[PDB]
C-alpha cells in the first residue's frame, strides 16, 4: 500500500471516501491485513493486550487523581451517609451563572459532578482514608501504565 | 460542427476556464509592494502551519488563563450559599 490504510492496498487503491472509513473499521482485524502470518498475528495481539492494560491503569489513575484533587473523599469518610461523592470538578465556559450555582454541590467551591461509580465506598472499604493515599495509588497505577 | 478531437482533448471534454481573465494586475503598485514584502513570512505553508497552530494555541491559552470574572461566569464562581441535597446530603 502506498497510502492509508497501509495494511490493505485493496482499500488503499479506493478513489472514494470509503477508503477512509473502512481503513478505520478494519484496523484491528489483523487476520485480514496484507502479508500477515500467525506470528505477526499473535505478536500484535500480545502488544495490543499490553496497550489495553496500559489504558486501564491510566484510566484508574485518572479516577484516583481526580477524586483526590477535586473531590470530597475525606469529608465523605467522615460522614458517608450525608455527603455526595464528588467525581471531578467542571470548567465549562459555556455555563451561565445559574448553571454555576446549581452544579456547586457537596462542599465544593465550584461546579462539580457527583460520582455514581461508587469508587468512594470501594476505596474506603479496602483501606483508603486520605487524599494522599489516593495520590500515591494514582502514581503507582501510572507507573504500571508506563510499565 | 463536431466536438471530438484526439489532438485537442481539452476542448473535447470541456476543460475550459469559464471566468478566468488574462488581465494584468489591477492592484495598487505601492500596496502591492507593501503586501509582497510584509505578507511574505506567511507564504511558506509549513512555517505558516506551525505559526498558526503554536501561535493560535498560545493566544487561546493566554485569553483563557486570564479571563475576567465579568466575562465568564465559570471563573466568577458561585456567589449564593449552597443548597442541601435531597436526603440531607451536603
Amino acid at each position: 500500500a502506498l497510502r492509508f490504510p497501509r495494511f490493505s492496498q485493496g482499500i488503499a487503491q479506493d478513489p472514494t471516501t470509503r477508503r477512509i472509513w473502512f481503513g478505520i473499521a478494519t484496523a484491528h482485524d489483523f487476520e485480514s491485513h496484507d502479508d500477515i502470518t500467525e506470528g505477526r498475528l499473535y505478536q500484535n495481539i500480545f502488544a495490543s493486550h499490553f496497550g489495553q492494560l496500559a489504558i486501564i491503569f491510566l484510566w484508574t489513575s485518572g479516577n484516583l487523581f481526580h477524586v483526590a484533587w477535586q473531590g470530597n473523599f475525606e469529608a465523605w469518610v467522615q460522614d458517608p451517609f450525608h455527603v455526595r461523592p464528588i467525581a471531578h470538578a467542571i470548567w465549562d465556559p459555556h455555563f451561565g451563572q445559574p448553571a454555576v450555582e446549581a452544579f456547586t454541590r457537596g462542599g465544593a467551591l465550584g461546579p462539580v459532578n457527583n460520582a455514581y461509580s461508587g469508587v468512594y465506598q470501594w476505596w474506603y472499604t479496602i483501606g483508603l482514608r486520605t487524599n494522599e493515599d489516593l495520590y500515591t495509588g494514582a502514581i503507582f497505577l501510572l507507573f504500571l501504565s508506563f510499565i | 460542427s463536431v466536438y471530438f478531437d484526439l489532438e485537442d482533448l481539452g476542448n473535447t471534454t470541456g476543460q475550459w476556464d469559464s471566468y478566468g481573465s488574462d488581465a494584468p494586475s489591477p492592484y495598487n503598485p505601492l500596496q502591492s509592494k507593501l503586501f509582497e514584502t510584509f505578507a511574505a513570512p506567511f507564504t511558506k505553508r509549513g512555517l505558516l502551519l506551525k505559526f498558526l497552530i503554536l501561535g493560535g494555541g498560545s493566544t487561546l491559552a493566554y485569553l483563557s488563563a486570564t479571563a475576567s470574572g465579568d466575562i465568564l461566569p465559570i471563573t466568577r464562581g458561585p456567589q449564593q450559599p449552597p443548597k442541601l441535597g435531597p436526603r440531607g446530603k451536603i
Binding site: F4 | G57, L60, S64, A65, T75
Partner: peptide, 29 residues
C-alpha cells in the same frame, strides 16, 4: 480552577485541531 482554564481549552480545542489536521494530512498522503 486555575489549571482547568488552561487544560480544558487545550484538550477541547487545540488538541483536536492538531490531531484532526495531522490525521487529515496522513490520510490524504
Amino acid at each position: 480552577i486555575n489549571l482547568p482554564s488552561l487544560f480544558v481549552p487545550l484538550v477541547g480545542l487545540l488538541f483536536p485541531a492538531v490531531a484532526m489536521a495531522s490525521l487529515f494530512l496522513h490520510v490524504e498522503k
